[PDB]
Amino acid sequence: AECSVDIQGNDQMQFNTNAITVDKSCKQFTINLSHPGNLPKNVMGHNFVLSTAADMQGVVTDGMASGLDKDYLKPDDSRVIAHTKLIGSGEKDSITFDVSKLKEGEQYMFFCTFPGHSALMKGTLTLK
Ligand SMILES: [Cu+2]
């Protein structure tokens, strides 16, 4: 099965998917994030951040509080399973994480932690 997904974040605070399934036969899983919009990171930064559904709002809230200098994630946040950099117009960043960090049954969310983006920029991820 495939163990990679391409995802874009744009100038209208939208991700171009809101559902990812990770095949259980994948040992690693890669996210390729890009930003085909015009706006820079300090205005319309997007990251791909992954947590349990339960942990999402805390990571977002503490992330807002951490500020731009920290890519809007709180330092040493163990709730974050994986994440990309926060990127701006025309940038790219990819990450690969260990699929064994995930667990069958559990619900995961991906989302952007730039202030106010997570209402519109979020989706589910599920080991299947
Ligand atoms: Cu964003």
Curated annotation (Swiss-Prot):
Its main location: periplasm. GO terms for molecular function: copper ion binding; electron transfer activity; identical protein binding; transition metal ion binding; zinc ion binding. PROSITE patterns: COPPER_BLUE (PS00196). It comes from the Bacteria. Residues 1-128 form the Plastocyanin-like domain. Transfers electrons from cytochrome c551 to cytochrome oxidase. Cu cation binds at residues 46, 112, 117, 121. Disulfide bonds join 3-26. One of its GO terms (cellular component) is periplasmic space. Keywords: Copper, Disulfide bond, Electron transport, Metal-binding, Periplasm, Signal, Transport. It is found in: Periplasm. CDD domains: Azurin (cd13922). This is Azurin. NCBIfam families: azurin. SUPFAM superfamilies: Cupredoxins (SSF49503).
